[PDB]
mmCIF file with all atom_site columns, N, CA and C in Angstrom:
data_model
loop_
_atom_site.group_PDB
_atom_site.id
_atom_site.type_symbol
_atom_site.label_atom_id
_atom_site.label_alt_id
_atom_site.label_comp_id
_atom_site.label_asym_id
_atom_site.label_entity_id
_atom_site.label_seq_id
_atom_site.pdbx_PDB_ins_code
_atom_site.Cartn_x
_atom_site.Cartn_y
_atom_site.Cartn_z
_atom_site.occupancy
_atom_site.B_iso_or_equiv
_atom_site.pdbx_formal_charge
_atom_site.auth_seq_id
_atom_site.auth_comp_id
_atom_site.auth_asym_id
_atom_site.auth_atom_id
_atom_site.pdbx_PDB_model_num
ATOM 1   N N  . UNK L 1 1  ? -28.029 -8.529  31.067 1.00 0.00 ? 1  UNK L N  1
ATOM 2   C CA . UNK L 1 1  ? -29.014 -9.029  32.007 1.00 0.00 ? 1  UNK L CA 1
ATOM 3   C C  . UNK L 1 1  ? -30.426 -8.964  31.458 1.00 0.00 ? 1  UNK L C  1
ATOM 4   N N  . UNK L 1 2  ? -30.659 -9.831  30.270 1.00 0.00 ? 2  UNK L N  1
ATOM 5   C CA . UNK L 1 2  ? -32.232 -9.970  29.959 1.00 0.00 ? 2  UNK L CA 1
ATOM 6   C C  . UNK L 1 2  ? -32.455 -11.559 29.449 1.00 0.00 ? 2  UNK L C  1
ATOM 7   N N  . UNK L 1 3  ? -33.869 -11.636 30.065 1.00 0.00 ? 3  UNK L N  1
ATOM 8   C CA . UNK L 1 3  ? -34.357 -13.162 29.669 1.00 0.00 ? 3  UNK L CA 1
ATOM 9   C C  . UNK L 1 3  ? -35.654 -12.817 28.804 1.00 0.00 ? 3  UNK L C  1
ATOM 10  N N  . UNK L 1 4  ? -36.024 -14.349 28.309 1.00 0.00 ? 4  UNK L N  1
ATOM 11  C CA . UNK L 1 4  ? -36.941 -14.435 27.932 1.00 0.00 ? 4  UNK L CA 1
ATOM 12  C C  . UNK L 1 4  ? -38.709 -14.141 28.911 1.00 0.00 ? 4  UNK L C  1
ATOM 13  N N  . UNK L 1 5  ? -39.208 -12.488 28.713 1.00 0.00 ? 5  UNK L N  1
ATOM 14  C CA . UNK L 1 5  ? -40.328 -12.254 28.859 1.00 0.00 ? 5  UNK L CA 1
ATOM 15  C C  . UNK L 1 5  ? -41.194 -11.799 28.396 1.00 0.00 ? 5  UNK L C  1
ATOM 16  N N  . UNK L 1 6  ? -42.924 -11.722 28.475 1.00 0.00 ? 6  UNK L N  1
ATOM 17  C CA . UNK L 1 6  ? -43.537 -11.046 27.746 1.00 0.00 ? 6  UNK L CA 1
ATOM 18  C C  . UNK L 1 6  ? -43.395 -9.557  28.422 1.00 0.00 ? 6  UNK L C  1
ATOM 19  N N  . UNK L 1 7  ? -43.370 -8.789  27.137 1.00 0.00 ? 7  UNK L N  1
ATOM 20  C CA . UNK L 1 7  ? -43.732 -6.902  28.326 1.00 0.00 ? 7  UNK L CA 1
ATOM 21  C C  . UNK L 1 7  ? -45.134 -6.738  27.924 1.00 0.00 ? 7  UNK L C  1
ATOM 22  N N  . UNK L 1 8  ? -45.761 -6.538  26.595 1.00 0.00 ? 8  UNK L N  1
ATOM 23  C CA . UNK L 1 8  ? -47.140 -6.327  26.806 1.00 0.00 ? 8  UNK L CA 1
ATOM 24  C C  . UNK L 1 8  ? -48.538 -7.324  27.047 1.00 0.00 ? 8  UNK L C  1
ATOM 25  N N  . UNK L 1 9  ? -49.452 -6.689  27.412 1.00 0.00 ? 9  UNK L N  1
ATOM 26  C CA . UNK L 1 9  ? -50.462 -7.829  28.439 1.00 0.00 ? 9  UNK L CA 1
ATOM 27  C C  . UNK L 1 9  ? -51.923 -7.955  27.049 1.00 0.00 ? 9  UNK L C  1
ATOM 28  N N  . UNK L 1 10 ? -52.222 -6.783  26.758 1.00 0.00 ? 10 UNK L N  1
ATOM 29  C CA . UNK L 1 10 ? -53.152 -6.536  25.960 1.00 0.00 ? 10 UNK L CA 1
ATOM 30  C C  . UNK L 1 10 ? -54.411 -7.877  26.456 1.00 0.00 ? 10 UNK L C  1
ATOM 31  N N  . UNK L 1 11 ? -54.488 -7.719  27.384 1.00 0.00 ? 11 UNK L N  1
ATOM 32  C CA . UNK L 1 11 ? -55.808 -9.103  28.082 1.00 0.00 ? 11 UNK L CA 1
ATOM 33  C C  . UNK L 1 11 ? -56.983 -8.311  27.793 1.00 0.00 ? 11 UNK L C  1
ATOM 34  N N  . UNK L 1 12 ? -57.874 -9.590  27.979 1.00 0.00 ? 12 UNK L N  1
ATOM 35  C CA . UNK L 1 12 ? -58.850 -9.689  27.436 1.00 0.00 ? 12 UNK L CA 1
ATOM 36  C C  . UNK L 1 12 ? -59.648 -8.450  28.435 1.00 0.00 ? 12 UNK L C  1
ATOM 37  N N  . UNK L 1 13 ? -60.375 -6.497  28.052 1.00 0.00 ? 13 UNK L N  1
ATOM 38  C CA . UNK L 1 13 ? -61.163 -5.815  28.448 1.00 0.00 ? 13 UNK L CA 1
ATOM 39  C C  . UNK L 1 13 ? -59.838 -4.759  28.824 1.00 0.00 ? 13 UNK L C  1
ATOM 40  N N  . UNK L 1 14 ? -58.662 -4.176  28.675 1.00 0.00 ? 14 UNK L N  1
ATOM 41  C CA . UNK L 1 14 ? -57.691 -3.591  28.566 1.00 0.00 ? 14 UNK L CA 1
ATOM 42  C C  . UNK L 1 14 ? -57.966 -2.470  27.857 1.00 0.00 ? 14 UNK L C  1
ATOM 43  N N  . UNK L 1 15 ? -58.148 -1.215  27.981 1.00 0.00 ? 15 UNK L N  1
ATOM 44  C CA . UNK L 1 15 ? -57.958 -0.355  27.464 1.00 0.00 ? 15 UNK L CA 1
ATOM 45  C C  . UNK L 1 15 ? -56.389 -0.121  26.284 1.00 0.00 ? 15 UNK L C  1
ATOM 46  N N  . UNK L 1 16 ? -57.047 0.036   25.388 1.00 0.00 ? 16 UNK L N  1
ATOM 47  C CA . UNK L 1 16 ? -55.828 0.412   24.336 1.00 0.00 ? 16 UNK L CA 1
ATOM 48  C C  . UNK L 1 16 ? -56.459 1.065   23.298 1.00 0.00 ? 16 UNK L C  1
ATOM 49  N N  . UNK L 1 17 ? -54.750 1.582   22.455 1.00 0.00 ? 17 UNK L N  1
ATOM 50  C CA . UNK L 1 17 ? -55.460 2.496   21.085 1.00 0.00 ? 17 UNK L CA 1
ATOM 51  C C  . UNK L 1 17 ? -54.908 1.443   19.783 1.00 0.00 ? 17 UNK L C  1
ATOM 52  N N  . UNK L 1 18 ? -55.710 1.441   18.861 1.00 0.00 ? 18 UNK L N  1
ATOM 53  C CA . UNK L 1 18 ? -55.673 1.086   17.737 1.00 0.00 ? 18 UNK L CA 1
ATOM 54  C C  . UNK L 1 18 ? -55.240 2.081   16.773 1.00 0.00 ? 18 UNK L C  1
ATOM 55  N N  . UNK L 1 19 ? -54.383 1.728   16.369 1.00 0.00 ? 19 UNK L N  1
ATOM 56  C CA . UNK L 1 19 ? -54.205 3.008   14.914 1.00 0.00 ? 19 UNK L CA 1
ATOM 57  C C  . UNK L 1 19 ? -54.826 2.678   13.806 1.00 0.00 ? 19 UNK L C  1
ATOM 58  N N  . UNK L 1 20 ? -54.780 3.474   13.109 1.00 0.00 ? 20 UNK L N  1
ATOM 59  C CA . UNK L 1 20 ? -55.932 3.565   11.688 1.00 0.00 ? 20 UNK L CA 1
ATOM 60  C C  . UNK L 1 20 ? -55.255 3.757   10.449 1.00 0.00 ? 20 UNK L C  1
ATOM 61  N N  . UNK L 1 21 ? -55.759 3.729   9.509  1.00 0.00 ? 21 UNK L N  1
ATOM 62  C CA . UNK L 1 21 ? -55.214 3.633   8.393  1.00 0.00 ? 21 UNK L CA 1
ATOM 63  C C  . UNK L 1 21 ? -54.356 5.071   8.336  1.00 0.00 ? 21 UNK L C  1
ATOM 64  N N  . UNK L 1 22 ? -55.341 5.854   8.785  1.00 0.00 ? 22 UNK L N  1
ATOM 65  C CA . UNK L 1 22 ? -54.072 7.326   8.671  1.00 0.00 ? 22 UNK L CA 1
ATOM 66  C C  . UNK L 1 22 ? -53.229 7.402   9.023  1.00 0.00 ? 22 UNK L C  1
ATOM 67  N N  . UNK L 1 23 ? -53.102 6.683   10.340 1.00 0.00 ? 23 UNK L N  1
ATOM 68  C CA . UNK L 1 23 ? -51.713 6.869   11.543 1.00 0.00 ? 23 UNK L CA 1
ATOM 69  C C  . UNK L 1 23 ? -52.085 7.194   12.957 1.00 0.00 ? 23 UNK L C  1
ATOM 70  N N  . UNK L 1 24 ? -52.623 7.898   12.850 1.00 0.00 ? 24 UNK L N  1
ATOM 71  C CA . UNK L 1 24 ? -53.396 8.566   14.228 1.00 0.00 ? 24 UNK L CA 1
ATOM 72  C C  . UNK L 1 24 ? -53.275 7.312   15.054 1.00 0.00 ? 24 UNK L C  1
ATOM 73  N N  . UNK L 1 25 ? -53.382 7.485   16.497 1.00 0.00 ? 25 UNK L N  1
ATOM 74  C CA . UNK L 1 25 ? -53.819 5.981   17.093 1.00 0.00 ? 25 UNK L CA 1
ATOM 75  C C  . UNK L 1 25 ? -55.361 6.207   17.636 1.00 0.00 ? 25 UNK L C  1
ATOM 76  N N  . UNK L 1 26 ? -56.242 5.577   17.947 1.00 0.00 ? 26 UNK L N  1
ATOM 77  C CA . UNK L 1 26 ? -58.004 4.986   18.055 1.00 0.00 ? 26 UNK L CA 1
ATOM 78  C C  . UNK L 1 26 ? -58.006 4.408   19.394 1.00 0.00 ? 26 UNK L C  1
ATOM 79  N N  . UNK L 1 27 ? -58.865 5.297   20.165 1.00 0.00 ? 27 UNK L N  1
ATOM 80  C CA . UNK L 1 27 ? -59.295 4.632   21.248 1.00 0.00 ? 27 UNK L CA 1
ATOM 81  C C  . UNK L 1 27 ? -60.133 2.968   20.667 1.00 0.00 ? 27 UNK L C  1
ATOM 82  N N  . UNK L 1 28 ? -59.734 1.786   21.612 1.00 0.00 ? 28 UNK L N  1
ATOM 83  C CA . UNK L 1 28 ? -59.888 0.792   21.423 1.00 0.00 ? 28 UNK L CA 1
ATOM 84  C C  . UNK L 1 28 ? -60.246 -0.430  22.476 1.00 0.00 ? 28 UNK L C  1
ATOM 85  N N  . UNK L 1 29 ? -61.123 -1.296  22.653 1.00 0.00 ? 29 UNK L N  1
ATOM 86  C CA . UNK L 1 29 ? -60.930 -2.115  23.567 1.00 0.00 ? 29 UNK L CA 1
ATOM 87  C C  . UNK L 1 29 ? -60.867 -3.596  23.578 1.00 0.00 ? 29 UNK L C  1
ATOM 88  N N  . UNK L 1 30 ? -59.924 -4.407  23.747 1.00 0.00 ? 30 UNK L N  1
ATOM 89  C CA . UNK L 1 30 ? -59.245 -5.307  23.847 1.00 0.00 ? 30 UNK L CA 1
ATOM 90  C C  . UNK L 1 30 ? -60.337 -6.558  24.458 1.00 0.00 ? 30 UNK L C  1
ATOM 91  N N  . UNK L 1 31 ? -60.950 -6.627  22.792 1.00 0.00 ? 31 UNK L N  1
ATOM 92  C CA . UNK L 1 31 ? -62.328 -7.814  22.900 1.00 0.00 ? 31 UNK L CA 1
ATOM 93  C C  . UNK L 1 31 ? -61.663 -9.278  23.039 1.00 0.00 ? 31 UNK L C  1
ATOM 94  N N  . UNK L 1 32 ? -60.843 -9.647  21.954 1.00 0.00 ? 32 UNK L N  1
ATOM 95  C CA . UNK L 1 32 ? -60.281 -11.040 22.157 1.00 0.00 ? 32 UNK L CA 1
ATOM 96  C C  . UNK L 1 32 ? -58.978 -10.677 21.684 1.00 0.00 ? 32 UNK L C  1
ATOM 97  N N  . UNK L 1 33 ? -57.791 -12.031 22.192 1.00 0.00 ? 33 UNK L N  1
ATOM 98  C CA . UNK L 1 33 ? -56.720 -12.283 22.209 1.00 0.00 ? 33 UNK L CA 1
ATOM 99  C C  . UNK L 1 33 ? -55.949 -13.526 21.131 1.00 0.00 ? 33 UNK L C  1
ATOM 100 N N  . UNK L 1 34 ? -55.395 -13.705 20.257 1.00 0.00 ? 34 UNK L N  1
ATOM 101 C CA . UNK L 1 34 ? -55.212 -14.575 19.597 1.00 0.00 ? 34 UNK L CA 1
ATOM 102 C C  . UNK L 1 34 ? -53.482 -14.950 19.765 1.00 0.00 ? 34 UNK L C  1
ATOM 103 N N  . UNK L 1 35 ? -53.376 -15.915 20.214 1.00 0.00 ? 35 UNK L N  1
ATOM 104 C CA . UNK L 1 35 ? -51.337 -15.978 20.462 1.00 0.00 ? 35 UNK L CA 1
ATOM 105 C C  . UNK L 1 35 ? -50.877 -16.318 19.317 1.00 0.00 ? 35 UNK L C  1
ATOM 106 N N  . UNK L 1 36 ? -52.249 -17.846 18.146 1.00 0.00 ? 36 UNK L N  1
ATOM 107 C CA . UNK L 1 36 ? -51.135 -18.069 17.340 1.00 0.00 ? 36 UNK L CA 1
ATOM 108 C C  . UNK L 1 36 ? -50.765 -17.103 16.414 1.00 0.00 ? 36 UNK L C  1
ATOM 109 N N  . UNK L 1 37 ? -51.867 -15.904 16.319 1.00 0.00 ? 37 UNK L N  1
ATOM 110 C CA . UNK L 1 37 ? -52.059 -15.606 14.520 1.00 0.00 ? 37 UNK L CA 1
ATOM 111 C C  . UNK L 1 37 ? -50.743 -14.047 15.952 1.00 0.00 ? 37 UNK L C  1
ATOM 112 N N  . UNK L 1 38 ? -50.548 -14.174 17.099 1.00 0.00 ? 38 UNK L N  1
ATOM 113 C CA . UNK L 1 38 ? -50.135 -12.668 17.675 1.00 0.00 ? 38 UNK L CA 1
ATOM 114 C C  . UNK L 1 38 ? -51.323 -11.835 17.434 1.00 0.00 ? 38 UNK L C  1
ATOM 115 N N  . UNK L 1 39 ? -52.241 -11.987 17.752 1.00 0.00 ? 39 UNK L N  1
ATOM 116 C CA . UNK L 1 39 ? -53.253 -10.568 17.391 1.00 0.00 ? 39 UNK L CA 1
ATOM 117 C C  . UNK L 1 39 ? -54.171 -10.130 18.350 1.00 0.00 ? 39 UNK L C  1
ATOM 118 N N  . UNK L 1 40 ? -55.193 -9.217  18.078 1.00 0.00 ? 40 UNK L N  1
ATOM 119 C CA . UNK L 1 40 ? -56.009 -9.262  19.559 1.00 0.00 ? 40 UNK L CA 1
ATOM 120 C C  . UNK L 1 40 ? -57.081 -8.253  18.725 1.00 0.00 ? 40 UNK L C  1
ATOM 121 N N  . UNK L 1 41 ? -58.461 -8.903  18.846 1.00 0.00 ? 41 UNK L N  1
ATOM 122 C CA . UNK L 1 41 ? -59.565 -8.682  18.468 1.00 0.00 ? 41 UNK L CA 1
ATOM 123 C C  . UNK L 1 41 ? -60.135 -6.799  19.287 1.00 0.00 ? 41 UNK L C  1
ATOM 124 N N  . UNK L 1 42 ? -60.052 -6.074  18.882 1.00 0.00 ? 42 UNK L N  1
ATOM 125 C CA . UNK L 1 42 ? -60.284 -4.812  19.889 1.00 0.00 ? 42 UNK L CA 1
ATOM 126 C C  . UNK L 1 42 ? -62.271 -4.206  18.638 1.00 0.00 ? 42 UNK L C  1
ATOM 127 N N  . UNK L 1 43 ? -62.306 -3.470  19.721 1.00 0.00 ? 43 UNK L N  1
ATOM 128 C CA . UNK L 1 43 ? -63.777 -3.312  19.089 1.00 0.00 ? 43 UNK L CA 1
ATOM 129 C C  . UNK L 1 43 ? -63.395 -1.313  19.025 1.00 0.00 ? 43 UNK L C  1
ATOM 130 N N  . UNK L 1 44 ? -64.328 -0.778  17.962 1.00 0.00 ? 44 UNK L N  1
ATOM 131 C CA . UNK L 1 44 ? -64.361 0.637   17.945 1.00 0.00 ? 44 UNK L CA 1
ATOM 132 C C  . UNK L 1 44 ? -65.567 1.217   18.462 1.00 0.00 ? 44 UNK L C  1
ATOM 133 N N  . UNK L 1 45 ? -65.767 2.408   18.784 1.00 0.00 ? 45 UNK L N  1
ATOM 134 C CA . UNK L 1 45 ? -67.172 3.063   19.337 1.00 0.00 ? 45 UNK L CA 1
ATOM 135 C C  . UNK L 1 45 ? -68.164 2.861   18.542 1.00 0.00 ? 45 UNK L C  1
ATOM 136 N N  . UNK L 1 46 ? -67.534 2.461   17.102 1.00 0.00 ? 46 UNK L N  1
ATOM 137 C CA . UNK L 1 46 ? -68.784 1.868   15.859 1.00 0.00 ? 46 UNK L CA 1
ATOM 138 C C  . UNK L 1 46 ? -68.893 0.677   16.064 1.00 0.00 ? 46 UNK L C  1
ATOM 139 N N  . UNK L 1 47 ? -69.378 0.062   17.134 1.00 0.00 ? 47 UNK L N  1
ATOM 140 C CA . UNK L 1 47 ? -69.460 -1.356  17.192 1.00 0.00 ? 47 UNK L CA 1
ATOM 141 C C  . UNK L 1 47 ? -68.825 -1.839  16.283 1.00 0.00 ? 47 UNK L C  1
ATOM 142 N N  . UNK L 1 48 ? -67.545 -1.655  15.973 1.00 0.00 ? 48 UNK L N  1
ATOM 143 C CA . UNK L 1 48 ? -66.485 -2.403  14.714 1.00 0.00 ? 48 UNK L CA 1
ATOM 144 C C  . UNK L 1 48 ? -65.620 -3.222  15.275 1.00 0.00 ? 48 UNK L C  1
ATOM 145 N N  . UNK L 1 49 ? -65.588 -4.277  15.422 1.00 0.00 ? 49 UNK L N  1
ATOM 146 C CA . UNK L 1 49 ? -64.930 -5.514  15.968 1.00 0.00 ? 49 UNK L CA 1
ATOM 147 C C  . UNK L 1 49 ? -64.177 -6.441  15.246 1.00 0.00 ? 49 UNK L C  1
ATOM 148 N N  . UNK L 1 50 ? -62.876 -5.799  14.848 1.00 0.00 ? 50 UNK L N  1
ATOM 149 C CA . UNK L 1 50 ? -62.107 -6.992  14.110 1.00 0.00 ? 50 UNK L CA 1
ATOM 150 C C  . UNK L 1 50 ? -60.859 -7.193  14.483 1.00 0.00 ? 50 UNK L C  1
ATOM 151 N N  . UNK L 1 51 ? -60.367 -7.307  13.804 1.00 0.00 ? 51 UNK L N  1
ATOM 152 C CA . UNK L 1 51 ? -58.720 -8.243  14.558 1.00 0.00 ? 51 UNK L CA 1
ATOM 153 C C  . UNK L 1 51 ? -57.423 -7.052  13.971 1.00 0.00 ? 51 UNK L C  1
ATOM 154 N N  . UNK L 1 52 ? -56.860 -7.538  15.296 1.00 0.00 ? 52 UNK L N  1
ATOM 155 C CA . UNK L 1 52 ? -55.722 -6.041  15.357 1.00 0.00 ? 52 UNK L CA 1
ATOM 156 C C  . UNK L 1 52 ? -54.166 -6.515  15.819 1.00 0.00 ? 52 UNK L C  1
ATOM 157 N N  . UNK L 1 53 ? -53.729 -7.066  15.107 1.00 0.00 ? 53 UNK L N  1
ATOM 158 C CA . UNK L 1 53 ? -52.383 -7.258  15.060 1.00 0.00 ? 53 UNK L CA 1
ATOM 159 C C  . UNK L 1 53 ? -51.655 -6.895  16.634 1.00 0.00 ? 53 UNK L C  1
ATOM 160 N N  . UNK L 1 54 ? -50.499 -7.192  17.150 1.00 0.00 ? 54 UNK L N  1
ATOM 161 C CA . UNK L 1 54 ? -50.384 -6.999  18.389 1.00 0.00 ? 54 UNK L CA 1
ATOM 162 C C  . UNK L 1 54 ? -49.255 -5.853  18.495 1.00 0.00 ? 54 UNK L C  1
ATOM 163 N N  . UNK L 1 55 ? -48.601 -6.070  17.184 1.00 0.00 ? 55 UNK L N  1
ATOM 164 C CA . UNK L 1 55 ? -47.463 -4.327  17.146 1.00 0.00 ? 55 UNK L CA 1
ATOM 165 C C  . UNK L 1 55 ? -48.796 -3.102  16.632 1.00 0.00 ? 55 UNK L C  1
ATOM 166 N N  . UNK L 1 56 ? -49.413 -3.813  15.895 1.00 0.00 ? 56 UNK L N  1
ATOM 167 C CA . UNK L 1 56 ? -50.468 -2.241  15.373 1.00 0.00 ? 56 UNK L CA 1
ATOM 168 C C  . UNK L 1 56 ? -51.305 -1.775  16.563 1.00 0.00 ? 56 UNK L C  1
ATOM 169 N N  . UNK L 1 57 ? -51.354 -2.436  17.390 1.00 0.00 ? 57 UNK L N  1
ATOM 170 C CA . UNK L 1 57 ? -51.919 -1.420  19.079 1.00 0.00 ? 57 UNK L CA 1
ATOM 171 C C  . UNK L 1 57 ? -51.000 -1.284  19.614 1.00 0.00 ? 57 UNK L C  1
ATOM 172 N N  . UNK L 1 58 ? -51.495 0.003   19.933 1.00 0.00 ? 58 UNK L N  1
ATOM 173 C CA . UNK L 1 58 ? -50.817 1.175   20.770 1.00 0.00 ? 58 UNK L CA 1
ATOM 174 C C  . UNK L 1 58 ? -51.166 0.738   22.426 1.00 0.00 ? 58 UNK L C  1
ATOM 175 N N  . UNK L 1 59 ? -50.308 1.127   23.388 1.00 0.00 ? 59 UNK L N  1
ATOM 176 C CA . UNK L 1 59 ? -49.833 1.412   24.890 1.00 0.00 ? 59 UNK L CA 1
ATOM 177 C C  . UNK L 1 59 ? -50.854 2.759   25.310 1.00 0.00 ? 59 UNK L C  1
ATOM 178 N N  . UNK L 1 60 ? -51.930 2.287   25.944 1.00 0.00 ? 60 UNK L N  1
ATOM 179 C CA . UNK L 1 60 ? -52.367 3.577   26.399 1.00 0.00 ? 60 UNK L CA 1
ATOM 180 C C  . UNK L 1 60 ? -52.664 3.762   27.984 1.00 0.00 ? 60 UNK L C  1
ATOM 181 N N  . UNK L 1 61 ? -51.469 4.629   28.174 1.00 0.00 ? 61 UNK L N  1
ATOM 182 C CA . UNK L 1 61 ? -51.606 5.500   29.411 1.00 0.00 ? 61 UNK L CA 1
ATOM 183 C C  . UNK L 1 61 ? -52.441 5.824   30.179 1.00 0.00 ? 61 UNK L C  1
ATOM 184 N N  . UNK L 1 62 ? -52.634 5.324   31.830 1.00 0.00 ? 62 UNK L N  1
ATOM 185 C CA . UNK L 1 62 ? -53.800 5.785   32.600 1.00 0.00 ? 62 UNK L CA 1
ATOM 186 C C  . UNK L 1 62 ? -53.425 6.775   33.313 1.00 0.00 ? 62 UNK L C  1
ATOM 187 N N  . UNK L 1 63 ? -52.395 6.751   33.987 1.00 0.00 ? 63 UNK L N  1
ATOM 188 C CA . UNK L 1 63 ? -51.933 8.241   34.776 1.00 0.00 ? 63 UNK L CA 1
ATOM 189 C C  . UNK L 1 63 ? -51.550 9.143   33.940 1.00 0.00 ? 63 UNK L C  1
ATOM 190 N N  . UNK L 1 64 ? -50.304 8.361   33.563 1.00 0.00 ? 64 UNK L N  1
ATOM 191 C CA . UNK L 1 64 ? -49.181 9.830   32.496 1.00 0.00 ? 64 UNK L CA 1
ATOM 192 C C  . UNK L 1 64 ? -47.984 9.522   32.786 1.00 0.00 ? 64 UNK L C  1
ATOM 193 N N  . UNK L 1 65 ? -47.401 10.885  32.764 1.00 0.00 ? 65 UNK L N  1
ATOM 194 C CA . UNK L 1 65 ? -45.612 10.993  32.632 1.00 0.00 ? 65 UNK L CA 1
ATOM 195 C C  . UNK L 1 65 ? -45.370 10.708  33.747 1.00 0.00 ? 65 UNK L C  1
ATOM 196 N N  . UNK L 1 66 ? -45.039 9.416   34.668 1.00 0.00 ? 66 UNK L N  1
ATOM 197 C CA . UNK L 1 66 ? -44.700 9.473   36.119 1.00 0.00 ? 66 UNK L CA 1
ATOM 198 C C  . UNK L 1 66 ? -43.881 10.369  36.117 1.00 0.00 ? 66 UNK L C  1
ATOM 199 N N  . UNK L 1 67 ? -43.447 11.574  36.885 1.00 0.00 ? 67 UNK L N  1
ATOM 200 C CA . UNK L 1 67 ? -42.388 11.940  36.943 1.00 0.00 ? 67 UNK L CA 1
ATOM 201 C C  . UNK L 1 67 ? -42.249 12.166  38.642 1.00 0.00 ? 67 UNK L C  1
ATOM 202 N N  . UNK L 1 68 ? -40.598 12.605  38.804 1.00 0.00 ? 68 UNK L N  1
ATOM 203 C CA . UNK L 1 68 ? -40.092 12.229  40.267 1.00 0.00 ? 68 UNK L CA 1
ATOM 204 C C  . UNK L 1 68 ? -39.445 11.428  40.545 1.00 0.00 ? 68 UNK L C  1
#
């Protein structure tokens, strides 16, 4: 029982993390969106604004572990 859908949104002002060359993942925010290249422009606290692949950002959590 699965169809064709998108699961992540990464829209345009979305909080997300970027990972870095080390690994770590980077608080990040989700400046522009690109479908053909799959990518999405996110900016760093260094006014660093470049293009970020759409598997290399990270899912970041606003509540937490729902649990219950």
């Amino acid at each position: 029982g699965s169809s064709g859908s998108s699961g992540p949104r990464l829209w345009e002002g979305q909080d997300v993390l970027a990972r870095w060359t080390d690994g770590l993942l980077y608080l990040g925010t989700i400046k522009k969106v690109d479908s053909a290249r799959e990518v999405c422009l996110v900016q760093f606290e260094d006014d660093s604004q470049f293009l970020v692949l759409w598997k290399d950002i990270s899912p970041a959590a606003l509540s937490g572990p729902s649990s219950g």
